[PDB]
Design a protein around this nucleic acid. Sequence first.
RNA 1: CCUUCUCAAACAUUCUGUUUGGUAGUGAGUGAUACUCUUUGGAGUUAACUUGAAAUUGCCUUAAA
Lengths: 247, 150, 284, 125, 256, 50
Amino acid sequence: FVRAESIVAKTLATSREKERIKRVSILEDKKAKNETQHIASGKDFILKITEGLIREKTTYDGKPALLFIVRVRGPLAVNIPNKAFKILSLLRLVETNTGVFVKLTKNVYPLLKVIAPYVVIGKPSLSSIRSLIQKRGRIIYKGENEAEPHEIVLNDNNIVEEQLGDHGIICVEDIIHEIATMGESFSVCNFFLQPFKLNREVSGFGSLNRLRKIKQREAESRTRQFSNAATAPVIEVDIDSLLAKLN
Amino acid sequence: EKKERLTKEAAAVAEGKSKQDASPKPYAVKYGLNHVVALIENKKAKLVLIANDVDPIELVVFLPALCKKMGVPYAIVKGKARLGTLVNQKTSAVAALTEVRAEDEAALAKLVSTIDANFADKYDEVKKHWGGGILGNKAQAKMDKRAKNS
Amino acid sequence: RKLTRALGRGEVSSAKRLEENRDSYTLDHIIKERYPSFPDAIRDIDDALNMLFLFSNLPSTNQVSSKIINDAQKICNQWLAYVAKERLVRKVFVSIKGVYYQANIKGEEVRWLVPFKFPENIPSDVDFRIMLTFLEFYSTLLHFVLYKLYTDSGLIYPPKLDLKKDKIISGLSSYILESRKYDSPVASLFSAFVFYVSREVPIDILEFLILSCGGNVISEAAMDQIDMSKVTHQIVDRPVLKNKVAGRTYIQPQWIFDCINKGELVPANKYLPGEALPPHLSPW
Amino acid sequence: EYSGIIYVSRLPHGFHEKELSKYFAQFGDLKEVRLARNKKTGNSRHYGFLEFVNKEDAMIAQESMNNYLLMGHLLQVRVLPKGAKIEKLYKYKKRVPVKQLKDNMKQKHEERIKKLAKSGIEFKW
Amino acid sequence: AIPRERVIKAVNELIKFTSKPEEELKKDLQLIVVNNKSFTGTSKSFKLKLLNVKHSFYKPWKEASATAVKDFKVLLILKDSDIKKVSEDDLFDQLDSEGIKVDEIICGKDLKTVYKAYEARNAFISQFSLILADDSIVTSLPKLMGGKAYNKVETTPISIRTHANKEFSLTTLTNNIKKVYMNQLPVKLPRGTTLNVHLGNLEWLRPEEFVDNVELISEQLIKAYQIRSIFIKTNRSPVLPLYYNQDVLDELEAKK
Amino acid sequence: LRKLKPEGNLLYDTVRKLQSSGKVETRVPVRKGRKYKQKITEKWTHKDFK
RNA sequence: CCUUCUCAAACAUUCUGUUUGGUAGUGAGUGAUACUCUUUGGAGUUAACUUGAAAUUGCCUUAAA
């Protein structure tokens, strides 16, 4: 049975999401068209939430950089829209608690602005990416066998030779330098990396770990804000402290 | 919560010198049975709840009649531990509500309109019917086969 | 059970009250009655260190509770920083299953593994909680013996670690030492040397060796976020190399391996790749 | 005795024909459903109608959801007598020379001026 | 601009008209109306255009409701971070001096929690005639309070420059509210071409002040929206042309 | 050395060490199992709600 | 059984002034004052007044089990 209350709340939530995505999408459309007489505010903004918490708002003025993001579930009723299903299906973040890197720019900023409620965001550190890629990482690989229901963890840099020697690239440490320093175009690596299947920070359903689920939900609904203003800043956190839990 | 309230208000009355009303008013259910039945016949209730599962049923049988008399919107909840969950006792066997924050006034007032919808006409048929006229399956099959043969 | 009753009844403040108000178990009496104490402990820590350095490398998921992992990583790096600052390694042997070491710590020569920092894949055929329990016991064991070690040397135990270092390398530059001669000769080899390591080679086993055999280091990959002033050596394991300069010998790590494994400090003549190698010349 | 048709009431927002169809499929095969939308800035006036197929399906659904609850509307429902012939409520979405008219303005300026003059409220111009 | 003597005799004509033939309350409050070329179509704004005025009528309004029963009064709605910052002691220091008084202070969480029960919502706000809200909140309001407030211009909200950029403190707004009370008034702009404005009432300030007030707003409106023609009434009367501009009429099909 | 692919699962190997050195018994982790049906049927209340 | 577009610039400092843009709604009805269009088709704009959110007919996966 289908919980009529849940039906109507689902309808309301998806309609609200539809409103805000149409709002921000058409906002960005008229921004790009640059008829900017009627817009509440003409620029991006960036809230770097840190640790009742400590909030710092800034503007991009890119100066491009990278980011690392994770799909989190929610919010809490929704049958999804096509206008984010297509996006995150391209980006390979469904089947959640999954990690992918990204290069920031003005083409892609509003995509973060639409996906932001579904997702957590923040920049990584060198130790954090190094930990991530040495502990985790997988590969799709083909030849002499294996019609590809396939996955391979990183153990062979000769694979990096035979697939990225065309780029002059061996040595996933050298890949890491390319990533961290934003070297040669970042994109073979992003399209290749078979993105990270991180762990849920808490399995449970014992009476102890349920408590941690509740504390976790308190923390995430504290730090995240589905304000849906269409001018609000992006949200950025201490991912360095978070993926210590999540890795 | 009480002891935090006390260690607050001790400093509040020591420095701020209130009347021990610097702290705000509470808005809470009122859950002793004698408290409830005292409040009734002052009509200081807007909804009371009643638990079906009490084997010393003499404690409870007079309540729906009395609540009917005093015109208060009674309700027979199923489960007494369910009522204890909201007082932080194992069992309460009643709960009541007399004063509410404003932000659920409509909630309460409409809840009353559901409750009397569920009860006001059912009162005619609850009382004209002596429950428990039921048989077990063997006797039932016996009389069914008898009616079938006849 | 009490917590379960609580969460069924609601009472979540009381559930937090229960969880903060408990006192879990410890094993100090278990250790300091089972092992009398010091020589036996340092003799039989080998199987402890093996599983610890394994668990610090393998991935977090269910059955892991990665607080466990960061704890094991912390005590692992504490151990390595102590022994490398006090300059004790006696053998090294690279192999496919990581690398085995050898150190004459206070008498008996302890042998132990540190694997390659790479994403192993799990069978899901092994039973895990047994190994976790083993690990908890071994972690407590090493905590005790390492407190004893730092104290008898005399030191500020446990080591703090500066977050700006931990976020860039998360290495042995972290877990910094504060107090309160040597193994003669194989300590302080490469004395007054400087090795600029290439990014290409993994530091995960270079830096324990280099810091045990005293000499300062700088990494290529370390400066990705942010001098070659007095640099003496360059290391790389790449076929091609450029723009190589005259200030540094451009060498391989088997030079280091043979150098410490025989205490001879061989030159870099059979080196400067891509010429082939004296193949491993294992100690056994 | 009744008809299969049903009248419903006191609906909240977010509750549309799709919700009705998917929900009330559960009580049997539904024949056809229709609710009341405004023809102006189209949104619901919070009622509708339905017949699943059957009188018995109608009455059991009524017996179930007679005083059903959700947030702070509550559904009431009525089984009808025979027929009652749902007929209407097509669905409505949100509906979205100069000198000649200047002479029209100029003359009707005078027309309104004489009209207020003969009210009578006297005025020049 | 309009002949001011035409304005004078027009207001004298209106008051002597209505002086003799709930009813008087419906029929006495002055309204002023204007046609323009065309308003912003398919864009339903809810801001109010703030005119400058030399003499406000809200002081007469409180003086009149002191006798009457409706109790003309003010609302002030704030961000959630602000009620703790502000209090009634400060406005008691500030506003009674120049001779007004705030009635209450309130937040939007209270709006969505205790002024749900839409009956009680409208019953709460219909007590209030004058509404002051924040620039931050003005976009968020209509999901909260609803079009019953917005159809009437009394209830319909308005922004205010609260945040001294950045880290707001009270005085930057306590002077602004004094400005908007004493020396500024709102104007709404609906769809289409017509625009009515609830100017005031005839029991409030004399014609000799009303006349230059209407002159002020008319001369600042003829420049504002390229208006078409200007009239007045009080709540039944046909339209009184006091400015019918025709050079503005010729560009309409020139737009096409 | 960049060429080096390590090989051999240290979990399997150290578990062999455990079982070999007489610390633990040789075992599966083996998953669930039931002997009998643990019959389903309906509650009194859903049975007699009529 | 969710829970709401809860700030952006410009200037010169006055912690403070001018301007800029920022909302499409619970619906039901009550009577009623005026303006455009274009062909009757009235579509849109215009005072204020009630109602307990009221009511019968206007071409994704641990948020599981």
